[PDB]
Design a protein around this ligand. Structure first.
Ligand SMILES: [K+]
Ligand SMILES: [K+]
Ligand SMILES: [K+]
Ligand SMILES: [K+]
Ligand SMILES: [K+]
Ligand SMILES: [K+]
Ligand SMILES: [Mg+2]
Ligand SMILES: [Mg+2]
Ligand SMILES: [Mg+2]
Ligand SMILES: [Mg+2]
Ligand SMILES: [Mg+2]
Ligand SMILES: [Mg+2]
Ligand SMILES: [Mg+2]
Ligand SMILES: [Mg+2]
Ligand SMILES: [Mg+2]
Ligand SMILES: [Mg+2]
Ligand SMILES: [Mg+2]
Ligand SMILES: [Mg+2]
Ligand SMILES: [Mg+2]
Ligand SMILES: [Mg+2]
Ligand SMILES: [Mg+2]
Ligand SMILES: [Mg+2]
Ligand SMILES: [Mg+2]
Ligand SMILES: [Mg+2]
Ligand SMILES: [Mg+2]
Ligand SMILES: [Mg+2]
Ligand SMILES: [Mg+2]
Ligand SMILES: [Mg+2]
Ligand SMILES: [Mg+2]
Ligand SMILES: [Mg+2]
Ligand SMILES: [Mg+2]
Ligand SMILES: [Mg+2]
Ligand SMILES: [Mg+2]
Ligand SMILES: [Mg+2]
Ligand SMILES: [Mg+2]
Ligand SMILES: [Mg+2]
Ligand SMILES: [Mg+2]
Ligand SMILES: [Mg+2]
Ligand SMILES: [Mg+2]
Ligand SMILES: [Mg+2]
Ligand SMILES: [Mg+2]
Lengths: 53, 116, 110
RNA sequence: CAUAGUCAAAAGAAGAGUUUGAUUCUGGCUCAGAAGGAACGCUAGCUAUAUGCUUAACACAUGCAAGUCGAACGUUGUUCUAAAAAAAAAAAAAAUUUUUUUUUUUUUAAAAAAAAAAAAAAUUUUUUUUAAGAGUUGAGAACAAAGUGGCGAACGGGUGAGUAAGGCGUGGGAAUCUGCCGAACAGUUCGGGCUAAAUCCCGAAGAAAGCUAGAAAGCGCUGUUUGAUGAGCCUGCGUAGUAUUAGGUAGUUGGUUAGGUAAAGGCUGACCAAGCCGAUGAUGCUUAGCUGGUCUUUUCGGACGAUCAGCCACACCGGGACUGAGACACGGCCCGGACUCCCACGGGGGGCAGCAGUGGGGAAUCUUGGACAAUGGGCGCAAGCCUGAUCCAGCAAUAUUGCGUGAGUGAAGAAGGGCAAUUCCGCUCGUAAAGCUCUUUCGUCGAGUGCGCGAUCAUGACAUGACUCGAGGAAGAAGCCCCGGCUAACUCCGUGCCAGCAGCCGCGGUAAAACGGGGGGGGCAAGUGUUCUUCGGAAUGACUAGGCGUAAAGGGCACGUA
């Protein structure tokens, strides 16, 4: 399985929204995120507003 | 804290050649010795990682200590100026106080003499 | 001994794990020193698994001599904080896998 | 540039009936809401996740819940056999032999290769018995077969009896210890004892302990400095009711000096002083584990402290210590007690408030299940072995904003039921049913792949599941309460202050919408009523947010302590 490893704490933050993420393939290598994985990162962030509509 | 620091300074690593590197020997006794040596090598690598992490935490602690000391001496300098300014204002107010108190005391002394 | 181990969260038949710094004598889901992250053993829609870790706290606990358990050794190798465990050199068991494609949305054979 | 940027953290405030001839006020009673570890009635299709002895900390049949290590150590006794490497596939019944190179030893300086019985050959060979406390018997396998020793059985698991402050919540402190784990340094020497040995015990230095050329620079031990984690000790503040309990204390409060402890300390021996606590409630009595939290609620409060997690206490009832880094130790030891089971009658044995389970009590609360696959834990270098921790199945509408029990059409407005100057198909059950067409969720039945997934280097209990495909036929799946007012929903018959109903006000004495049945209707719905219990409504203990002239309620009036 590929994993998607997030850095937690105040020193791992990518900004307001969560921590920075990388992939870590099963062969032992790690890589930055894809475009699909970037969409996954963006859709799971908390939103600083009430629900409109 | 920010995306740029993490995106630049993350060690992204190659494929690990240790995975799948076992070659099956012809003797089970030698295979057990080989697995034992693999466990010993893992212990050595873990110890090296522990030493690296000890040094990293020490350097971060030293940096935080010197930053806190710098902020402390700047704060002490600002307080030493604020204290002297307030002392000068207090001195000039106390010097202004004495003339008013002397005049007021003279007024009250006159009133007491009239009543007597 | 301080241990980096896995606490079970989730519900029945829906496992979820937290990565914990504990005294070894503590109960599995009981007392702990620190929550260090999480791990999701079930595969998601992206085709992989999820994990989060507090990298600086894991470095702190490894520097003072904490001992990771058997799944935490694999999880910490996979994140790059520990060397590979000795048994990953053995390679995977082979055999004929059913590579007939299934539709992603419906689960039926294409 | 960007895996950037966005600043969210609530909602929640309802009234009605009942005192009078009527009124307004005061003031209670009752009702509509939410909820529970619930119980009972009637009635029930499914999946999932939770929850499930609140009473007797009552008594317990049976099995399981803590072991592991031969890489610490001897011991006896089982088996079987008498040098290392490489090749043997083709012509004139076949497992074990032939060839090539190294190596130990013997025999006559280059080559050759234990005793006895029976037989053969010219000392050797074939078969057999005893070998092997024996001029080193060469390898091997189990030894579990029983032990000594280490580590762990102080964790995990259970219960809430006691405990009102030696506990708990929160924040601190000094006068301590700390196995395993991380990181430095130094050592690991020599004698004796347990039938035999040792990493067991004793002695000497300076403290110790050795194993492995099978684990030879790998483990282990000891001493000294440290990190980490735990533990002991102390303390500020906060944390029940009761004054129809006013005094309590005498190692008590303090001092000195000895002892004890890892460590401060009346912890305690002795001596000295008379202190200490208390109307800001000591002491007595009653109740109670505490917290995070759970239910309710326009904020506050009230009730609760069950599941789960943190802390504490306890382990049949009392009292002790030993071993240990750690216990005054649930499944350890010693003693006393009650109960109980064996006894060959001398004496022994036991402790489910571990998981199942059984009696008993009770309105009431489950299987004498599967697997260590996952996670966590013990032992082991590992291989592994343990683990009723756990994971997962079983029983129970106990709970949960879940899903289903069809979707359409259908007028002979069928039959049948109920009501009716007996009005409009007379009104209604009623498009309701049946019939006809469509779809098969849930459940049912039959199959198929499985590195689908939980788990990966590998290992799957669940799994007779799930998933995918196929068969089939609206088929297998709707009740409970209510209909006088509060409160949505009305008629007929029976009864006649009877039988009965009832949360409150009240109904029933011949036309009862109130009792009981028929018919119809309303609310909820796999539930729905009834009882118990909590909060709300209740501003009905009023901080938020009430009162005391005549309704409950100003002390007869002052003086003065806090
Ligand atoms: K605590
Ligand atoms: K006791
Ligand atoms: K296991
Ligand atoms: K019921
Ligand atoms: K049907
Ligand atoms: K006065
Ligand atoms: Mg009256
Ligand atoms: Mg219980
Ligand atoms: Mg033993
Ligand atoms: Mg025990
Ligand atoms: Mg215990
Ligand atoms: Mg429990
Ligand atoms: Mg409790
Ligand atoms: Mg009192
Ligand atoms: Mg009690
Ligand atoms: Mg309480
Ligand atoms: Mg008992
Ligand atoms: Mg021990
Ligand atoms: Mg001791
Ligand atoms: Mg027991
Ligand atoms: Mg039991
Ligand atoms: Mg009974
Ligand atoms: Mg394990
Ligand atoms: Mg180990
Ligand atoms: Mg079990
Ligand atoms: Mg429901
Ligand atoms: Mg189906
Ligand atoms: Mg089937
Ligand atoms: Mg699998
Ligand atoms: Mg099942
Ligand atoms: Mg009405
Ligand atoms: Mg009548
Ligand atoms: Mg009525
Ligand atoms: Mg009636
Ligand atoms: Mg109130
Ligand atoms: Mg109110
Ligand atoms: Mg008030
Ligand atoms: Mg009032
Ligand atoms: Mg007044
Ligand atoms: Mg008066
Ligand atoms: Mg009066």
């Amino acid at each position: 399985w590929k994993i998607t490893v997030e850095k937690l704490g105040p020193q791992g933050k990518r900004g307001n929204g969560g921590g920075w993420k990388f992939v870590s393939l099963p062969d032992g290598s790690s890589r930055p995120l894809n475009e699909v994985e970037k969409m996954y990162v963006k859709r799971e962030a908390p939103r600083r507003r009430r629900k409109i509509l | 804290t920010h995306h740029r620091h993490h995106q630049e300074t993350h060690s992204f690593l190659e494929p690990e050649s240790y995975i799948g590197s076992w070659e099956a020997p012809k003797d089970p006794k030698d295979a057990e010795r080989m697995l034992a040596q693999l466990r010993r090598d893992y212990a050595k690598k873990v110890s090296l990682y522990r030493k690296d992490y000890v040094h990293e935490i020490e350097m971060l602690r030293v940096e935080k200590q010197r930053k806190d000391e710098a902020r402390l001496v700047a704060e002490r300098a600002a307080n030493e100026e604020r204290r002297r300014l307030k002392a000068e204002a207090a001195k000039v107010r106390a010097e202004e106080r004495k003339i008013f108190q002397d005049e007021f005391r003279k007024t009250l002394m006159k009133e007491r003499a009239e009543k007597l | 001994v301080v241990r980096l181990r896995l606490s079970r969260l989730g519900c029945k038949n829906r496992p979820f794990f937290r990565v914990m710094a504990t005294d070894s004598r503590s109960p599995r889901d009981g007392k702990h020193i620190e929550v260090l992250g999480y791990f999701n053993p079930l595969p998601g829609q992206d085709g992989g698994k999820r994990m989060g870790l507090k990298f600086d706290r894991i470095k702190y606990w490894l520097s003072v001599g904490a001992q990771a358990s058997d799944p935490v050794q694999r999880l910490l190798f996979r994140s790059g904080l520990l060397p590979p465990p000795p048994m990953v050199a053995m390679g995977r068991k082979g055999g004929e896998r059913d590579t007939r494609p299934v539709d992603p949305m419906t689960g039926r054979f294409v």
